[PDB]
UniProtKB/Swiss-Prot annotation, chain A:
The chain holds residues 1 to 103 of 309 of the full protein. A zinc finger (RING-type) spans 6-50. Stabilizes the cyclin H-CDK7 complex to form a functional CDK-activating kinase (CAK) enzymatic complex. CAK activates the cyclin-associated kinases CDK1, CDK2, CDK4 and CDK6 by threonine phosphorylation. CAK complexed to the core-TFIIH basal transcription factor activates RNA polymerase II by serine phosphorylation of the repetitive C-terminal domain (CTD) of its large subunit (POLR2A), allowing its escape from the promoter and elongation of the transcripts. Involved in cell cycle control and in RNA transcription by RNA polymerase II. The modification Phosphothreonine is found at residue 51. It is found in: Nucleus. Disulfide bonds: none annotated. Transmembrane segments: none annotated. The modification N-acetylmethionine is found at residue 1. This is CDK-activating kinase assembly factor MAT1. Highest levels in colon and testis. Moderate levels are present thymus, prostate, ovary, and small intestine. The lowest levels are found in spleen and leukocytes. It comes from Homo sapiens. It comes from the Eukaryota. Associates primarily with CDK7 and cyclin H to form the CAK complex. CAK can further associate with the core-TFIIH to form the TFIIH basal transcription factor.
Swiss-Prot record, chain C:
Recruits TFIIH to the initiation complex and stimulates the RNA polymerase II C-terminal domain kinase and DNA-dependent ATPase activities of TFIIH. Both TFIIH and TFIIE are required for promoter clearance by RNA polymerase. Tetramer of two alpha and two beta chains. Interacts with TAF6/TAFII80. Interacts with ATF7IP. Interacts with SND1. Part of TBP-based Pol II pre-initiation complex (PIC), in which Pol II core assembles with general transcription factors and other specific initiation factors including GTF2E1, GTF2E2, GTF2F1, GTF2F2, TCEA1, ERCC2, ERCC3, GTF2H2, GTF2H3, GTF2H4, GTF2H5, GTF2A1, GTF2A2, GTF2B and TBP; this large multi-subunit PIC complex mediates DNA unwinding and targets Pol II core to the transcription start site where the first phosphodiester bond forms. (Microbial infection) Interacts with varicella-zoster virus IE63 protein. A zinc finger (C4-type) spans 31-59. Zn(2+) binds at residues 31, 34, 56, 59. This is General transcription factor IIE subunit 1. It is found in: Nucleus. Belongs to the TFIIE alpha subunit family. The chain holds residues 99 to 196 of 439 of the full protein.
From Swiss-Prot, chain D:
GO terms for cellular component: nucleoplasm; nucleus; P-body; RNA polymerase II, core complex. Belongs to the eukaryotic RPB7/RPC8 RNA polymerase subunit family. This is DNA-directed RNA polymerase II subunit RPB7. Changing residue 158 to A: Strongly reduces RNA-binding. GO terms for biological process: nuclear-transcribed mRNA catabolic process; positive regulation of nuclear-transcribed mRNA poly(A) tail shortening; positive regulation of translational initiation; transcription by RNA polymerase II; transcription initiation at RNA polymerase II promoter. GO terms for molecular function: single-stranded DNA binding; single-stranded RNA binding; translation initiation factor binding. Keywords: DNA-directed RNA polymerase, Nucleus, RNA-binding, Transcription. SUPFAM superfamilies: N-terminal, heterodimerisation domain of RBP7 (RpoE), Nucleic acid-binding proteins. The gene is POLR2G.
UniProtKB/Swiss-Prot annotation, chain E:
Component of the RNA polymerase I (Pol I), RNA polymerase II (Pol II) and RNA polymerase III (Pol III) complexes consisting of at least 13, 12 and 17 subunits, respectively. Pol I complex consists of a ten-subunit catalytic core composed of POLR1A/RPA1, POLR1B/RPA2, POLR1C/RPAC1, POLR1D/RPAC2, POLR1H/RPA12, POLR2E/RPABC1, POLR2F/RPABC2, POLR2H/RPABC3, POLR2K/RPABC4 and POLR2L/RPABC5; a mobile stalk subunit POLR1F/RPA43 protruding from the core and additional subunits homologous to general transcription factors POLR1E/RPA49 and POLR1G/RPA34. It comes from Homo sapiens. Keywords: Acetylation, DNA-directed RNA polymerase, Nucleus, Phosphoprotein, Transcription. DNA-dependent RNA polymerase catalyzes the transcription of DNA into RNA using the four ribonucleoside triphosphates as substrates. Common component of RNA polymerases I, II, and III which synthesize ribosomal RNA precursors, mRNA precursors and many functional non-coding RNAs, and small RNAs, such as 5S rRNA and tRNAs, respectively. Pol II is the central component of the basal RNA polymerase II transcription machinery. Pols are composed of mobile elements that move relative to each other. The keyword Cell membrane does not apply. GO terms for biological process: transcription by RNA polymerase I; transcription by RNA polymerase II; tRNA transcription by RNA polymerase III.
Length: 103, 129, 98, 171, 86
C-alpha cells in the first residue's frame, strides 16, 4: 500500500485505510487527494514524465485494485487493441500455434 | 457557490439567455451607427471603442440569421444554456475537443451523434472576411 | 472506555487536517516596509510596467514574500509528514485495540 | 459569459434638466450612467438594448431630485468558476502572467505554468518560450485559460486563471 | 392595477385639504428655487414662496396627489380635480 509511493500530498495513506484510489492511462496510481491537490496547483500532468489528463479518465475505487503494477498493465493492453484480434485470427488460422504469440 | 463545470448556477442565472462575440458585436454596431449618422452633441467614451474592438477580434460570424442557426442545433439535445454558448462561440472542430472544454459533456450522449452536430457549425463558420 | 478512546482518536486526527487545510490558503504577499499583508487578487493593480516588479498602494516600496512559516509549495512537506509520525508511536496501541 | 437579462435601476434627474421632451432627457442620461459600471449581482453593464417601460416621477421630502423607475434590458458579464475563454496578454512578469479579458483582468500563478516555458530575463521583451524555442507567448497574444476563482470589485472584477491545462497556447 | 382604484369609484370629495395645500406650496417652492421652468408667466418677482402660490391659483402645477389608503391601496388626484379652500 504505502510501498508504491505517493505523488504530491505523500501524506494520505496513513490517514484513512479505506482510501479511494484512481488510475490513469500512462500507468500510474493516484489517490483522490492528489486529484484535487494537483488541479488547484496545475492540471493533469504526469509526476514522472508528461502525460496530459483532460477528460475524466479516472477509475475511482476504494477496494485497492492496483495491488501489483505488473498485473494491472497487462489487463489494460489486451482490452484495447488485442481484444479485437480475437476475431480476425480465427478467420485465417487452423491450429493452436499462433495463439501462443499473443500471450 | 457557483461552478460552471458541474452546472452549479444560482437562482438568478439559471434560465438566462447567453450571448456570444458576434451577437454582442452586432448590437454594439447599431450603437455606432447612431453616432455617425446622428452624433447629436454628446460624445461616447474609450470603453465603448475598446469593447467593440475586442468583440470583433474574436468574432467568427457575419450574417445575422447565420448566428441564430448555430444556437439552434445545440439545443435539441440534452445540454444546457451554458454548454450551448461554449459550443457556438468558440466553434469546436473535432468531437474530442468539445468534451475537453466542458467537463459535464463527457457524461452525456456518445460521440457518434456529436460529430454530425459539429458539421453544421463548421459549415457556417466564416473562414475569411 | 472502549468508545471514549476511539472518540478522541477521530478528533485528534481531524484537528491536524483542519489546521493544515485552513493554513495553506491565506496569502503570499507582504511589504517589508509598511508591514501590509497583501493577497494574490490585487496583482493587477500593484504592478508597475516601467520596472517589471511589484509596488504598494500609498508608497513606492518593493514587496517580498509573506513571512515563511505557512505550508507553501516546499514547506508543506515538512508539516504534512508530522501527521505520519503519529502512526508509529500509536501502532502498538491501535493494533492491540483493533 | 455574455448574458441578456432585464435590469431595474433608480435614475435621479436634476430638476433643471427637463427640456421640451422629458422622456428624451431621461433616456439620454441613462446611457451615460449605467454603462461602464458593474454590480455583484447582474454584472458588467456594457450597453442598453431596448427600453422596456418607464415609471412615473417619485418625489420624496428632503431630496429635490426626481426619480424615475426606468425598466430596461441591458447586457451583463458575470464570470463563473470553470469557464474556458480566451485572453490577451498585457504584461509578462517572472512571478506570474498578466492577462486581461476585455474589461476584466486575469491572473496566472507561477505554479500553473509548465517548466518548459521558463521566464528568460536575458532578453528585453519578456516572454514564455520553451527550451527548443517552439512557441513564444509574449505581449499582445491570443491565448486561452480556465477561470479558477471570480471576484467582484466596484467595476474592475477579478478572475484568477490557470495555464497548466492542455489545448491552450496560441490559438 | 391591484391597488390604484381611482378610475372607477372615488369616495373622498374632490376638494383640497389644509395638509395637501402645505406640501404643494412647499414642494413647488423648493423646485423653483433650484432653477425650474415656471409653468405660468412671470411678472417680476423673486420670492420663492410667492411663485408657488401664484401657480396654485392657475392650477398649472404638473403634480399628482397620491393618497395612500390605510387598508393598503391608494388613490390618485390632480390639481384641476381639487378645488382649493381659503
Ligand atoms: Zn496522494
Ligand atoms: Zn509517466
Ligand atoms: Zn508598502
Amino acid at each position: 500500500m504505502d510501498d508504491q509511493g505517493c505523488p504530491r500530498c505523500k501524506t494520505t495513506k496513513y490517514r484513512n485505510p479505506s482510501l479511494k484510489l484512481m488510475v490513469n492511462v500512462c500507468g500510474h496510481t493516484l489517490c483522490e487527494s492528489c486529484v484535487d491537490l494537483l488541479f488547484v496547483r496545475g492540471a493533469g500532468n504526469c509526476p514522472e514524465c508528461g502525460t496530459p489528463l483532460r477528460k475524466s479518465n479516472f477509475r475511482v475505487q476504494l477496494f485497492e485494485d492496483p495491488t501489483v503494477d505488473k498485473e494491472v498493465e497487462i489487463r489494460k493492453k489486451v482490452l484495447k487493441i488485442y481484444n479485437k484480434r480475437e476475431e480476425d485470427f480465427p478467420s485465417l488460422r487452423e491450429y493452436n500455434d499462433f495463439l501462443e504469440e499473443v500471450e | 457557490e457557483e461552478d460552471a463545470s458541474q452546472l452549479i448556477f444560482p437562482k438568478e442565472f439559471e434560465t438566462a439567455e447567453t450571448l456570444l462575440n458576434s451577437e454582442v458585436h452586432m448590437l454594439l454596431e447599431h450603437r455606432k451607427q447612431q453616432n455617425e449618422s446622428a452624433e447629436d452633441e454628446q460624445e461616447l467614451s474609450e470603453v465603448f471603442m475598446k469593447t467593440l474592438n475586442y468583440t470583433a477580434r474574436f468574432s467568427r460570424f457575419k450574417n445575422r440569421e447565420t448566428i441564430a442557426s448555430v444556437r439552434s442545433l445545440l439545443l435539441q439535445k440534452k445540454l444546457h444554456k451554458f454548454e450551448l454558448a461554449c459550443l457556438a462561440n468558440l466553434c469546436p472542430e473535432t468531437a474530442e475537443e468539445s468534451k475537453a472544454l466542458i467537463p459535464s459533456l463527457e457524461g452525456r450522449f456518445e460521440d457518434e451523434e456529436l460529430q454530425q452536430i459539429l458539421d453544421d457549425i463548421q459549415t457556417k463558420r466564416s473562414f475569411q472576411y | 472506555l472502549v468508545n471514549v478512546v476511539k472518540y478522541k482518536l477521530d478528533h485528534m486526527r481531524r484537528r491536524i487536517e483542519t489546521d493544515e487545510r485552513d493554513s495553506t490558503n491565506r496569502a503570499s504577499f507582504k511589504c517589508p516596509v509598511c508591514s501590509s499583508t497583501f493577497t494574490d487578487l490585487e496583482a493587477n493593480q500593484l504592478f508597475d510596467p516601467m520596472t517589471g516588479t511589484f509596488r504598494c498602494t500609498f508608497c513606492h516600496t518593493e514587496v517580498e514574500e509573506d513571512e515563511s512559516a505557512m505550508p507553501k509549495k516546499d514547506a508543506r512537506t515538512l508539516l504534512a509528514r508530522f501527521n505520519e509520525q503519529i502512526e508509529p508511536i500509536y501502532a502498538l496501541l491501535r493494533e492491540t485495540e483493533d | 459569459m455574455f448574458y441578456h437579462i432585464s435590469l431595474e435601476h433608480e435614475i435621479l434627474l436634476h430638476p433643471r434638466y427637463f427640456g421640451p421632451n422629458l422622456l428624451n432627457t431621461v433616456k439620454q442620461k441613462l446611457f451615460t450612467e449605467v454603462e461602464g459600471t458593474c454590480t455583484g449581482k447582474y454584472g458588467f453593464v456594457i450597453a442598453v438594448t431596448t427600453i422596456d417601460n418607464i415609471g412615473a416621477g417619485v418625489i420624496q421630502p428632503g431630496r429635490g431630485f426626481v426619480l424615475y423607475p426606468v425598466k430596461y434590458k441591458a447586457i451583463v458579464f458575470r464570470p463563473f468558476k470553470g469557464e474556458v475563454v480566451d485572453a490577451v496578454v498585457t504584461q509578462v512578469n517572472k512571478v506570474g502572467l498578466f492577462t486581461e479579458i476585455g474589461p476584466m483582468s486575469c491572473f496566472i500563478s507561477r505554479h500553473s505554468i509548465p517548466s518548459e516555458m521558463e521566464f528568460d530575463p536575458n532578453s528585453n521583451p519578456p516572454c514564455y518560450k520553451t527550451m527548443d524555442e517552439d512557441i513564444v507567448i509574449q505581449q499582445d497574444d491570443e491565448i486561452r485559460l480556465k477561470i479558477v476563482g471570480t471576484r467582484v470589485d466596484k467595476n474592475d472584477i477579478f478572475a484568477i486563471g490557470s495555464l497548466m491545462d492542455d489545448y491552450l497556447g496560441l490559438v | 392595477g391591484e391597488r390604484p382604484q381611482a378610475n372607477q369609484k372615488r369616495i373622498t370629495t374632490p376638494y383640497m385639504t389644509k395638509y395637501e395645500r402645505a406640501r404643494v406650496l412647499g414642494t413647488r417652492a423648493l423646485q423653483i428655487a433650484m432653477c425650474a421652468p415656471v409653468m405660468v408667466e412671470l411678472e417680476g418677482e423673486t420670492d420663492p414662496l410667492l411663485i408657488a402660490m401664484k401657480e396654485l391659483k392657475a392650477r398649472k402645477i404638473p403634480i399628482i396627489i397620491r393618497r395612500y389608503l390605510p387598508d393598503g391601496s391608494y388613490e390618485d388626484w390632480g390639481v384641476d380635480e381639487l378645488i382649493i379652500t381659503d
